[PDB]
Design a binder for this molecule. Structure first.
Ligand SMILES: O=C(O)COc1c(Cl)cccc1Cl
Length: 167
């Protein structure tokens, strides 16, 4: 049993809810919250800007030190950093950004990072301002992640559309 509440069960391991991931993280304090990161860990908007704002910019300060030491992530890659006031850990995952021309095949590689964690609170990778089709992102998630993932869809229409169209 875990603390996640109000989710619709899609599969053995994937759950979904219409929720603000920031508000959900603050309520649950999960072991792992996933950030929709870019390779520079520049957290300006969408999930990353919202998560970072909720940490009072401490996520960005930590991230800048990570990049200064290690250099940029790979598209499809990830790093584990602090979850600050939101979670124990934040798994920063870089899905491909369609609005930068990145290979959508890298979305599966991005989701494979989730398999290193038994339970996660996450957004749909490459959705929102990363420009991918969220229906596609949910299909890749279900077909790639084997650990228990609790998805936070920000848009109600998409939440209502993702459920209705789910095979
Ligand atoms: O709902 C999501 O989580 C991602 O997609 C979005 C977002 Cl973030 C905002 C407006 C519309 C859509 Cl379809």
């Amino acid at each position: 049993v875990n603390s996640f509440s109000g989710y619709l069960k899609l599969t053995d391991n994937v759950y979904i809810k219409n929720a603000d991931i920031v508000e959900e993280a603050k309520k649950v304090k999960p072991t792992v919250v996933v950030n929709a990161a870019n390779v520079y860990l520049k957290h300006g908007g969408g999930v990353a800007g919202a998560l970072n704002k909720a940490t009072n910019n401490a996520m960005q300060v930590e991230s800048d030190d990570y990049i200064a030491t290690n250099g940029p992530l790979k598209v499809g890659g990830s790093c584990v950093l602090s979850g600050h006031n939101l979670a124990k850990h934040c798994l920063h995952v870089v899905g491909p950004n369609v609005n930068k021309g990145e290979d959508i095949q890298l979305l599966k590689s991005a989701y494979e990072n989730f398999n290193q964690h038994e339970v996660l609170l996450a957004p749909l990778l490459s959705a929102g301002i990363f420009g991918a089709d969220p229906i596609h992102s949910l299909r890749v998630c279900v077909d790639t992640v084997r650990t228990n993932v609790y998805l936070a869809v920000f848009d109600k229409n998409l939440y209502d559309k993702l459920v209705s169209s789910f095979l």
